[PDB]
């Protein structure tokens, strides 16, 4: 098992921050990062605390939304120090912080999400989390941690929901053009949320909305990734 490290590609005028999935890592962003590099963009893909290790409990005990927001915020500052223009996207988790960045942080040209937010009552993550852990724990040569997981997961999911609900309430503050990408066969989050996000962005200069009809959740990595890359690049060029 290799620990995915944060990584960076140099560009010239325009940089892009990509914030990864919950239980994910910078690997979520490998195809997209490279696609943006091929179009001359700078890219930075940080690692959220607790993530990227052989031990699933690290996510639950070493990371939390406030840490991940600080890290998201620092990653944006890293790029807005260097490039004339900066874009910020993320998956579901990463996308909460990307939208909070558009709402609350200076110097961002545009941004958006590659999947719907994690909001109360609108997700089936517990089964997924436990399945992710089992794979990691098999891979590792380690025994089931379901019990310890269950003692923490609901607490953390509620932490994320709470963080997300505050971000959702402030979507009126977004002025930037905003990208919305959603998988059509998503079992982890309720894709209808993407339609609600579009509608909540009442002051966004524009909303570039895409649906990936036969794709599962992680559209940056699965069958939809070529289309996604094309649409995100076109969106960036449009600005």
**Under a CB-based contact definition with an 8 Å cutoff, are residues 7 and 30 in contact?**
no
- In the residue annotation, 51 being an active-site residue is answered as no
State the catalytic residue, choosing from 20, 51, 217, 225: 217
Q: What DSSP designation does 54 have?
A: S
Residue 39 appears among annotated catalytic residues: no
Pick the catalytic residue from 28, 161, 186, 190.
Answer: 186
Helix or strand (DSSP H, E) at 167: helix 146-169
140 vs 122: CA distance, rounded Å: 31
Residue with tokens 């696609």: 35
As to burial, measured by CB atoms within 10 angstroms (0-12 exposed, 13-18 middle, 19+ buried), residue 173 is: middle
Pick the closest to residue 198 from 113, 121, 119, 105 (CA basis). 113
The Cα–Cα gap between 209 and 226 comes to 16
Closest listed residue to residue 41, CA positions, set 51, 33, 31, 29: 33
Catalytic residue among 92, 123, 208, 225: 92
Question: Is 13 labeled as catalytic in the residue annotation?
Answer: no
Close Cβ partners of 150 (under 8 Å, ≥ 6 residues apart): none
- Give the catalytic positions in this structure: 92, 186, 217
């Amino acid at each position: 098992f290799r620990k995915p490290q944060p990584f960076e590609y140099e560009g010239t005028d325009t940089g892009v921050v990509l914030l990864h999935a919950y239980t994910g890592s910078p690997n979520d962003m490998n195809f997209m990062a490279r696609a943006l590099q091929r179009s001359g963009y700078g890219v930075y893909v940080p690692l959220f605390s607790g993530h990227g290790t052989v031990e699933p409990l690290d996510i639950l005990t070493k990371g939390n939304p406030d840490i991940w927001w600080a890290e998201s915020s620092a990653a944006v500052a890293h790029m807005t120090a260097k490039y004339a223009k900066v874009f910020v996207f993320g998956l579901s988790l990463g996308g909460i912080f990307a939208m909070k960045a558009l709402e609350t942080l200076p110097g961002i040209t545009a941004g958006g999400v590659f999947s719907s937010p994690i909001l109360p009552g609108k997700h089936h993550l517990v089964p997924g989390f436990l399945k992710y852990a089992e794979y990691m724990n098999r891979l590792a040569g380690k025994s089931d941690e379901s019990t310890q997981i269950l003692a923490y997961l609901p607490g953390q999911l509620a932490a994320i929901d709470q963080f997300a609900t505050t971000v959702a309430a402030d979507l009126n503050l977004v002025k930037q053009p905003t990208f919305i990408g959603q998988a059509g066969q998503d079992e982890l989050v309720d894709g209808r949320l993407a339609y609600q996000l579009r509608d909540a962005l009442i002051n966004a200069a524009r909303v570039d909305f895409h649906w990936y009809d036969d794709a599962k959740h992680v559209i940056t990595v699965n069958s939809a990734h070529h289309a996604l890359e094309e649409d995100v690049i076109a969106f960036m060029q449009q600005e």
